[PDB]
Amino acid sequence: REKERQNRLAEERARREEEENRRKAEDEARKK
């Protein structure tokens, strides 16, 4: 159960991270 929880939280973190990455990408694109 602990590993399930930790992995779920970890994928949530990674998904938020890729959200911010594509976000900064589209920001730079607007700068272009």
Side-chain angles (χ1 to χ4, degrees):
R1 307 146 52 254
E2 283 162 352
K3 303 322 153 288
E4 287 166 277
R5 295 164 263 181
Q6 293 142 31
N7 295 137
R8 291 179 248 119
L9 302 181
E11 315 318 299
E12 178 93 359
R13 299 178 266 268
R15 189 210 69 261
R16 291 168 278 184
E17 290 160 73
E18 56 81 20
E19 292 150 37
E20 316 318 299
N21 307 310
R22 54 89 186 166
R23 171 212 39 77
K24 81 197 48 161
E26 51 206 289
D27 305 315
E28 301 137 10
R30 303 166 312 90
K31 320 310 198 322
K32 188 51 189 62

